[PDB]
Amino acid sequence: LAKRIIACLDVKDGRVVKGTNFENLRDSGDPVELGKFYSEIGIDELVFLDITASVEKRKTMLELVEKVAEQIDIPFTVGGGIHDFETASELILRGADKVSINTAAVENPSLITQIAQTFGSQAVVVAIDAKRVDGEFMVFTYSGKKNTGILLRDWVVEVEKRGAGEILLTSIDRDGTKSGYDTEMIRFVRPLTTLPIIASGGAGKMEHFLEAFLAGADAALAASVFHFREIDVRELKEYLKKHGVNVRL
Secondary structure, eight states, X not given: OBOEEEEEEEEETTEETTOOOOTTSSSTTOHHHHHHHHHHHTOOEEEEEEOOOHHHHHHHHHHHHXXXXXXXXXXXXXXXXXXXXXXXXXXXXXXXXXXXXXXXXXXXXXXXXXXXXXXXXXXXXXXXXXXXXXXXEEEEETTTTEEEEEEHHHHHHHHHHHTOSEEEEEETTTTTOSSOOOHHHHHHHGGGOSSOEEEESOOOSHHHHHHHXXXXXSEEEESHHHHTTSSOHXXXXXXXXXXXXXXXX
């Protein structure tokens, strides 16, 4: 089964948060130039997650999307505080292939269906942040601040029922560590859904990607391991292909 490698660019005011080590770039913190470079070295898709302040956010995200769309030909997703249909719509129309929704989806699951009715299920990525609580996987909202009391098992099934196209599955237990993807969580979710699963949180080395794909992930997402050149994208794809993973070279 075909597997995807995805770079996540966390952005604010049109800048990559914490920058990169790519000295070859004219501007190492420019997300458009970084995104283009990633598409040239073999990244399959991009995700842009924005944390711009509210008054300038709508305009800032639309500007980013427009600029990105004219420079890359690979799919991209935009997210970060998308709370309604009109916001999602403007971003897709301006150039994004997909939108990611998280807190707003949990609070209004019909938002999934609303976006899918106009843009198709394939335009809707539901980002699910989850963590172990008393032996159960629970769904968290507000950038991991709120335990919703909703079981991961139940939310996965509902997300597919509502018409999502893909799940961006982040383990709060692993995110920010470089200890590996949460393969137990990925294996837990795999039999519950037919949708593509993007593994997120915990990437530290090439072997972690292999482990995530064995667990049933359809894609693997990472940020700082790529940005600070701990993992080279070309080397990663060659590694994965060598060990039997169906990646695009």
